[PDB]
Structure 1
Amino acid sequence: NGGWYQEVIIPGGKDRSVDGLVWVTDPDEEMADGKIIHGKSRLFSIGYTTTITEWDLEKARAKKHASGQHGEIWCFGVQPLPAAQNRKLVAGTVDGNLVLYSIEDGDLKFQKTLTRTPSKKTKFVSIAFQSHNIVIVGCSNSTICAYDVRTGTMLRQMTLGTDLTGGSKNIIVWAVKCLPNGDIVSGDSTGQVCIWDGKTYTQAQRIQSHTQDVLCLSVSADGSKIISGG
């Protein structure tokens, strides 16, 4: 409540880094007598590897490792709630192929691969979910693809022009996030922030703020404030 006390330090070994951190929190389950059981929260992490590691917070170590045949993972996110007992991690990686992992009853195994982009040089650098079945991935060929999880299809492909500030003609969408009212915020490499309306997946505003590239975003819970760090 404003104390900010660092509880626990779990260090990893030499030559190990950490890129993403995603908690998964189950819904509030009810007991037989009306008592409430809050969700059991688990911690997943990627380490610039082809592996997702689930950490045991009680044991103060890693619990499981999971590895599918793909590229090294760069970004990932949990499917949010609509179903209840069936929520899945979606991970975008370097070679492009959206791998999809399952987590049920405390298990972490590589379920399948949704798609892969046609170009091999397409690298997936961000991911955020619009709804229960629609994933928004930010791709280093100046691209923001909107895929659909159920059939694994490609709803649309929003795009951005070149950067006209310097050379290096590809822009890079370093982060995306989703507002509550369906719209998608996207921090890119021009130091812009692009608001895309999500009923049609198009751009509706470009805002130039930073001088160098945007690196991360955050949304208000109701969807009124946008924080952009670059």
Structure 2
Amino acid sequence: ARAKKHASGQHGEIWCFGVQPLPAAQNRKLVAGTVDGNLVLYSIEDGDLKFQKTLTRTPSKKTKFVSIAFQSHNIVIVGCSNSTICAYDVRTGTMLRQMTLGTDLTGGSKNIIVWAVKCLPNGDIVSGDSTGQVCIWDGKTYTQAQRIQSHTQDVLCLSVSADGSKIISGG
């Protein structure tokens, strides 16, 4: 009933993390997004917790990561500070596609902040943001199909039914 373990790869501050879902059977890994950008990949096999490696880091230094969720086995989604939603493939570590959001035309501070992303069980991606919208990204080509206005202030969390039929937005 206390801290089993700690682990630390050298970077800025870890802000969002999740484990790879199943499709191997015993090779499952943590994926953690942090302040400065670098997706770090952590290894947990047989009661271990150790920094495996760095997948990549974002190009710029102001790209802050806030939200993380897994579309599939190999396909990670991060939502990030400069109004962007990056779809990375983890295995190679490459950048499958950069989704992008526009300016928050209510208040100032141009760069919108994706606050929370999840993926629906049939693969589309849903993303609560800083203008309180909720985007429906078609997930095959990783772009938008709907922009729903939900709250007044910004979304803070999403949740989904497991069959993919009830989406809950928390603002």
TM-score of the two chains, using structure 1 as the length reference: 0.74
Q: For 2:61 and 2:106, locate their aligned partners in 1 and report how far apart those are by CA, in whole Å.
A: 26
Q: Which residue of 2 aligns with 1:106?
A: 47
Q: Deviation string for 1:49-87 (max 9, x for gaps)?
A: xxxxxxxxxxx1000000011111000000000111000
Q: Write out the 4+ residue segments of structure 1 that deviate beyond 2 Å after TM superposition.
A: none
Q: Deviation string for 1:174-221 (max 9, x for gaps)?
A: 000010111001000001000101110010100001000000000011
Q: For 2:118 and 2:22, locate their aligned partners in 1 and report how far apart those are by CA, in whole Å.
A: 16
Q: Helix, strand or coil: the match of 1:117? A: coil
Q: For 1:216 and 1:185, locate their aligned partners in 2 and report how far apart those are by CA, in whole Å.
A: 11
Q: Which has the higher contact order (CA 8 A, sep 6+)?
A: 2
Query: Could you list the runs of 5+ residues in structure 2 that have no partner in the other structure?
Result: none
Q: Helix, strand or coil: the match of 1:64? A: coil
Q: In the TM superposition, what are the counterparts of 1:131-210 in structure 2 within 5 Å?
A: 131-210=72-151
Q: For 2:102 and 2:13, locate their aligned partners in 1 and report how far apart those are by CA, in whole Å.
A: 27
Q: For 1:166 and 1:150, locate their aligned partners in 2 and report how far apart those are by CA, in whole Å.
A: 39
Query: Could you list the runs of 5+ residues in structure 1 that have no partner in the other structure?
Result: 1-59
Considering only CA atoms, is the larger Rg found in Structure 1 or Structure 2?
1
Q: For 1:93 and 1:204, locate their aligned partners in 2 and report how far apart those are by CA, in whole Å.
A: 29
Q: Helix, strand or coil: the match of 1:213? A: coil
Q: Deviation string for 1:88-139 (max 9, x for gaps)?
A: 0000000000000000000000000011111101000000000000000000
Q: Helix, strand or coil: the match of 2:7? A: strand
Shift of 1:161: 0.4
Q: Deviation string for 1:35-59 (max 9, x for gaps)?
A: xxxxxxxxxxxxxxxxxxxxxxxxx
Q: For 1:68 and 1:221, locate their aligned partners in 2 and report how far apart those are by CA, in whole Å.
A: 33
TM-score of the two chains, using structure 2 as the length reference: 0.99
Q: CA RMSD in A?
A: 0.4
Q: For 1:62 and 1:151, locate their aligned partners in 2 and report how far apart those are by CA, in whole Å.
A: 33
Q: For 1:71 and 1:84, locate their aligned partners in 2 and report how far apart those are by CA, in whole Å.
A: 31
Shift of 1:166: 1.0
Q: Which residue of 1 aligns with 2:26?
A: 85
Q: For 2:68 and 2:3, locate their aligned partners in 1 and report how far apart those are by CA, in whole Å.
A: 24
Q: How many residues align?
A: 171
Q: For 1:129 and 1:177, locate their aligned partners in 2 and report how far apart those are by CA, in whole Å.
A: 7
Between the two proteins, what is the percent identity of the paired residues? 100
